[PDB]
């Protein structure tokens, strides 16, 4: 019973800051890479982040470069994706992935509303 159960999306402001969370049970989580994706309206799913078994190998797409953080926790079967200066563009469902297994989703809004 694999689940990805993901948290920490929000409504925020250009500049402003988050950090998700997923948290994993029903495999072995610390022999795996654990990946983040996001899917932004009108687009196609993109890859974000991805950490290797072990956290010494680590991907960022181009665009979140700098800015964002990809970790794990492997104590507490856990990948976590601090994002910094967000802007309206990283707005999307962001997804946790592993193995052919995916997250619900959690929301990242980012908009200086006005």
């Known amino acids: 019973q694999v689940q990805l159960q993901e948290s920490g999306g929000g409504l925020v402001q250009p500049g402003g800051s988050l950090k998700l969370s997923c948290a994993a049970s029903?495999?072995?989580?610390?022999?795996?890479?654990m990946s983040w994706y996001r899917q932004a309206p009108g687009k196609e799913r993109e890859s974000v982040a991805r950490?290797?078994?072990?956290?010494?190998?680590?991907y960022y797409a181009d665009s979140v470069k700098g800015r964002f953080t990809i970790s794990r926790e492997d104590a507490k079967n856990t990948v976590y994706l601090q994002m910094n200066s967000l802007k309206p563009e990283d707005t999307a469902v962001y997804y946790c992935?592993?193995?052919?297994?995916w997250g619900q989703g959690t929301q990242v809004t980012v908009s200086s509303g006005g």
């Open positions: 950490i290797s078994s072990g956290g010494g190998t680590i």
């Open positions: 029903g495999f072995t989580f610390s022999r795996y890479a």
């Open positions: 992935y592993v193995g052919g297994f």
